[PDB]
């Protein structure tokens, strides 16, 4: 076992799991889900004594809410069995335990509803509504909604009740930023886009509205059920180990077409 030395002792035997997922979405103008997947990693940070037999249990459905892995690679320390149990003697400190992909039953934490109105050929009226879709006790953090503007843009007027927004002319986008937002809510932004005149013939190819966010759950639906520690020499049971998990779900590509 060349990934863990043999001397290791801690009074405080503790581990931390980070489930880190990036959720990706392409949505049609009329709310259809054109494409969506999650990529995830589980990172383990183990401060455990001796050489212990860890067993990682999740809400895998092949084994309540239960979920569907398309595929995954593991860290060499993992004993490949097909009971679908995850067994290993972990390296010390921090390492990547598994990497995975999911396409089915994904929680899309945000819904984006765009509305666009042409006003002659002098301006565009734009309304965008975002809906948080997740437990109300949970807050999303670091929410950005990026609304692209045409190249013939004289100037931009925006109102929003939540957040701050700026027209960023060099980037050709309005950028709305919200610090915090809770589950099962709505917010909207209105903007009026002043146009320059332009070659009437070439039309605007409206790129998507994209979002960034971070959420404290796994959009795949993954929940950690247990992490079991057995060290058969040393005199500490499983229930002596202090165990922690956190979830950090972040947008990848998360685009809604208008």
């Amino acid at each position: 076992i060349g990934w863990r030395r043999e001397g290791i002792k801690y009074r405080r035997n503790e581990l931390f799991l980070d489930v880190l997922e990036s959720v990706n979405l392409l949505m049609s103008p009329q709310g259809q889900v054109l494409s969506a997947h999650v990529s995830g990693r589980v990172v383990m940070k183990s401060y455990l004594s001796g050489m212990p037999e860890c067993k990682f249990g999740m809400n895998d459905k092949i084994v309540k809410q239960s979920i569907a892995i398309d595929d995954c690679t593991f860290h060499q320390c993992v004993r490949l069995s097909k009971e679908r149990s995850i067994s290993f003697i972990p390296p010390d400190g921090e390492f990547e335990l598994m990497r995975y992909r999911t396409t089915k039953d994904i929680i899309l934490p945000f819904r984006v509803i765009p509305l666009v109105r042409e006003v002659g050929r002098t301006k565009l009226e734009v309304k965008v509504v975002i809906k948080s879709n997740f437990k109300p006790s949970l807050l999303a953090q670091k929410i950005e909604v990026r609304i692209p503007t045409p190249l013939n843009t004289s100037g931009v007027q925006v109102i929003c009740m939540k957040g701050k927004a700026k027209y960023k002319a060099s980037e050709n986008a309005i950028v709305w930023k919200i610090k915090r937002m809770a589950g099962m809510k709505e917010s909207q932004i209105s903007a009026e886009i002043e146009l320059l005149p332009t070659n009437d013939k070439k039309k605007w190819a409206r790129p998507p509205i994209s979002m960034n966010f971070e959420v404290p759950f796994a959009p795949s639906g993954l929940k950690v059920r247990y992490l079991k520690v057995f060290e058969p020499k040393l005199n500490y049971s499983d229930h002596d180990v202090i165990k922690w998990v956190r979830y950090i779900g972040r947008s990848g590509i998360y685009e809604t077409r208008c």
Binding site: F16, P216, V224, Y226, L227, K243, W244, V245, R246
Partner: peptide, 6 residues
């Protein structure tokens, strides 16, 4: 943000 595994 870290919670106990129950």
């Amino acid at each position: 943000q870290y919670k106990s595994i129950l």
